[PDB]
Amino acid sequence: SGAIYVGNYRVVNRHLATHNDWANLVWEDSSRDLLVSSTTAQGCDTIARCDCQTGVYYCSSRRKHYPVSFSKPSLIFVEASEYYPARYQSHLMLAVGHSEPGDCGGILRCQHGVVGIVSTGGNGLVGFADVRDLLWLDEE
Ligand SMILES: NC(=O)[C@H]1CCCN(C(=O)Cc2ccc3c(c2)CCC(=O)N3)C1
Ligand SMILES: [Zn+2]
Question: Residues 21, 103, 104, 130: which is the catalytic one?
Answer without folding.
Answer: 104
